[PDB]
A paper describes a structure:
hL3HYPDH was first discovered by Visser and colleagues who identified, through sequence alignments between orthologs of the proline racemases family, the human protein C14orf149 (named after its gene locus and later named hL3HYPDH) which lacked racemase activity but exhibited instead proline dehydratase activity, converting trans-3-hydroxy-l-proline (T3LHyp) into Δ1-pyrroline-2-carboxylate (Pyr2C). hL3HYPDH is involved in the metabolism of hydroxyproline (Hyp), a non-standard amino acid present in the cell wall components of plants and in mammalian collagen and deriving from the post-translational modification of proteins by prolyl hydroxylase enzymes. While T4LHyp is metabolised following distinct degradative pathways in mammals and bacteria, the T3LHyp metabolic pathway is conserved in bacteria, plants and mammals, and involves a T3LHyp dehydratase (EC 4.2.1.77) which removes the hydroxyl group of T3LHyp without the intervention of a cofactor, leading to the formation of Δ2-pyrroline-2-carboxylate. Besides its role in the dietary hydroxyproline metabolism, hL3HYPDH has been also identified among the interferon-stimulated genes (ISGs) triggered by virus infection and showing antiviral activities.
Numbering used by the authors:
A (entry chain B): 4 to 150, 153 to 227, 240 to 354
B (entry chain A): 10 to 149, 153 to 226, 240 to 354
The structure:
């Protein structure tokens, strides 16, 4: 006898925040559809500043608990100054306001098409072009559709190797050799076996402690975080399993889009892989798979870089309406000390 | 709505929280939970509709610290509603502080007829797997909820224990609907007011494993068990090192028993308990003495505030490898 959809008791005068919940290989994304105050700014950068300095309570509500959690990520859609852009994105996380879109492009691309920010391509063509204005800059996502559903693919920034076979003394383990590469962020790459862990069986806590130790070691003796690998950097049809541990011991549920990019750069540099050769990357956390493909050579200062095609699937998970009660001490959310 | 698979019904939820711990009440889209009794229904859900639990409570649409409730008819004629609890570890029996949310819910959503205009609190009869709990909900429909504990008692006091990490420490074991070890945070060399959650968790975990060597989990305390108007801060670390967002309703119950036993508190004397995690406050009050075999128990009035956080529709894509959710382990 609750046929009629109703909201629960809330404070009228704080509008309802409405989201579409998506995920890209296990990492969630709340896209805000409605109930965010006007984000005033002549530019996306201006708008990012305004949100951080005026509407941060909105970020804290959607991303913090009790309505979110430690590994929740968010997106507020805004007009772009660029006439090329189908949409502008302000990214939200639990630590602040990110610049690197990364794999969220896969979800936002799919979203833009499915929600009509991008007109449907001619029935003859199947991949639609979505121009997303990140704080990063304009990223073009190519979304497969019918007349919709399928993989999304985007082209990386110039990705390169900063250092190879670098020996460091990681607390808890001996001197260890790491590669540091840029895939949109700086990651240390180590084999899990070289730290005395089986990536396929070991508890997440063990892989996190190990990877954290490497990240702290590299910080002093030379960086967004560390990726541990199964050590299958040798070309094969078999997927290669990696785990990304970044920031405050935070595990990525997806093969990091950045991580895929930097590993392809590393594989290219060691002569294990050629242009338009495609590997598959599997998440140790979730089992989801992204593909990388170096498409053309490039440069980044004096450094020989590569351009990488990352592709993967985003999925819809549902839709939420967030409300706040006048009384609630935890109206604007909380995070654990 | 987003593009979804038609033919898998939409799961619809009302998200609430009691002192920071969340509760998803399922409004619609759960298959018929077949069973002659609540017990039968809990069994059926665990053995046939577990995919529904995993969807609502797992990482894509939930998280490690998410809890859920499916409402069902009760066999008991007294009962306004029957509750099946869902969590990330399985199917709970402990009614718990979820009665605070469910009581408020039952009134606000008309499972309970509207109270008499004269009277400012309503009676909600909740059938938990444990049994029939009565919640008293303040109204004019918003306000705090209060319920009466089961028989709560002290199992052991000032017990020195073999802790791998700190050598030897004195702990109290009490029952508040579950068995909790109580130690002072300071006694493990931690300031409860400043220390990182990781530090307090690993300490409390160590005590829990140690006590097994001699139990739902361990509560670290402010040490302010001495009566005062000032609230007392506690942190509850139970099961697999999972922290409680609230002053545990069970925890409040057990320490009221412990405070009564040590002669720091009398009947109808009320303490306030503050969560180290979030800062939320539950009130405990021993109301009458009672018995549990030869053990002298107490009945405790636990009271707190539940708040609405919003509403979701969960969907499935037939393509999605993580349709049914996932956990890191």
């Amino acid at each position: 006898a609750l046929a009629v959809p109703r909201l629960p008791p809330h404070d009228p005068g704080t509008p309802v925040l409405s989201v579409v919940d998506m995920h890209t290989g296990g990492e969630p994304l709340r896209i805000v559809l409605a109930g965010c105050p006007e984000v005033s700014g002549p530019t996306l950068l201006a708008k990012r500043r305004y949100m951080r300095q005026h509407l941060d309570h909105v970020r804290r509500r959607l991303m913090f608990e009790p309505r979110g959690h430690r590994d929740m990520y968010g997106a507020v859609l805004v007009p772009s100054e660029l006439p090329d852009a189908h949409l502008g994105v302000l990214f939200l996380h639990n630590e602040g306001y990110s610049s690197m879109c990364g794999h969220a492009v896969l979800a936002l691309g799919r979203f833009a098409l499915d929600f009509g920010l991008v007109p449907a391509p001619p029935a003859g063509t199947r991949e639609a072009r979505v121009n997303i204005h990140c704080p990063c800059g304009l990223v073009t996502a190519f979304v497969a559709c019918e007349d919709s559903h399928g993989p999304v693919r985007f082209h990386s920034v110039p990705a390169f190797v900063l250092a190879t076979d670098l020996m460091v003394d990681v607390p808890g383990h001996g001197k260890v050799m790491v590669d540091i590469a840029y895939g949109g962020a700086f990651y240390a790459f180590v084999t899990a076996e070289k730290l005395g862990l089986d990536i396929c069986s070991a508890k997440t806590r063990d892989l996190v402690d190990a990877a954290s130790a490497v990240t702290e070691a590299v910080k002093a003796q030379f960086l967004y975080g560390t990726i541990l690998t199964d050590g299958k950097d040798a070309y094969t049809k078999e997927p290669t399993t990696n785990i990304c541990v970044f920031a405050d011991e935070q595990v990525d549920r997806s093969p990091t889009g950045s991580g895929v990019t930097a590993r392809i750069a590393l594989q290219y540099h060691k002569g294990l892989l050629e242009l338009n050769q495609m590997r598959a990357f599997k998440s140790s956390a979730t089992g989801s798979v992204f593909t990388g493909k170096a498409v053309r050579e490039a440069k980044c200062g004096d450094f020989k870089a590569v351009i990488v095609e990352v592709s993967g699937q985003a999925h819809y998970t549902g839709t939420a309406s967030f409300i706040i009660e006048d009384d609630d001490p935890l109206r604007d959310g909380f995070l654990l000390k």
